């Protein structure tokens, strides 16, 4: 049960940010011509844990990273406000339709470049499956 987890994360993300410009994995996407900010979506696989001794009940861990990129020379205020909104939306313990958020609302340090900066927002999701 790892495809449905990514499907659920995508469903939630489009449920919140359908209209905002965004990038999705392995799809041709061009940045906005106006130079404004756009969202970035990535899915990082974790590890699957065998919990019991009969190797039946398992667990799946995954990491979802959302990054905001904003043009150079335009401050870091609105980017931090957007990151705060992103963190507030993905509250800890939120129940998805396939799983739930194990750990949410984490903001990391800014990565700098001469063409565009980025503030990465990262959280994790978990699902539990019993095999019969």
């Amino acid at each position: 049960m790892h495809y449905e987890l990514s499907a659920a994360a995508r469903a939630a993300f489009l449920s919140k940010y359908r209209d905002f410009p965004h990038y999705m994995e392995n799809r041709n996407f061009t940045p906005p011509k106006d130079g404004g900010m756009w969202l970035r979506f990535n899915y990082i696989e974790g590890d699957t844990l065998y919990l019991s001794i009969d190797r039946k009940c398992k667990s799946y861990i995954a990491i979802v990273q959302i990054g905001v990129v904003f043009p150079p020379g335009s401050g870091v205020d609105e980017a931090r406000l957007k990151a705060k909104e992103i963190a507030d939306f993905f509250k800890d313990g939120k129940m998805l339709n396939v799983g739930y958020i194990f750990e949410g609302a984490i903001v990391h340090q800014i990565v700098k470049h001469e063409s565009g900066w980025m503030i990465p927002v990262r959280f994790t999701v978990r699902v539990d499956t019993k095999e019969t």
């Binding site: 990038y23 994995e25 996407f29 940045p31 900010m37 990129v69 043009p71 001469e114 063409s115």
Partner: protein, 121 residues
Amino acid sequence: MNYSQIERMARKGVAFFTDPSRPMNLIKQGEYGYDENGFEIPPMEQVIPISGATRRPNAREIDGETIRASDILGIFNNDHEINEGDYIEIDGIRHVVVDARPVQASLEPVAYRPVLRRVSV
């Protein structure tokens, strides 16, 4: 040696390899400043028209994520002096002037050869 003649030659040369149908603008946002707590934005755009020539297109590759960006180089005129942090509006696409690179051996450079990278990523 006379630099006015070089200026005229450079202007005519730039006007030769140019197309008078590409919309090109220029942005000089400036005069920022923080509030008594740190909340304020620069209220300047200063959009002005400009014309010139471009060459050497190049593609941007970061992680294999298919972002499909590109950047070019340009040659421009002496008026509306270019700086190290300006924006260029080439065919509705913004580029940031990373390098000014004036063709200079004297004051008031005859022309500029900026290096442009696409804004955002």
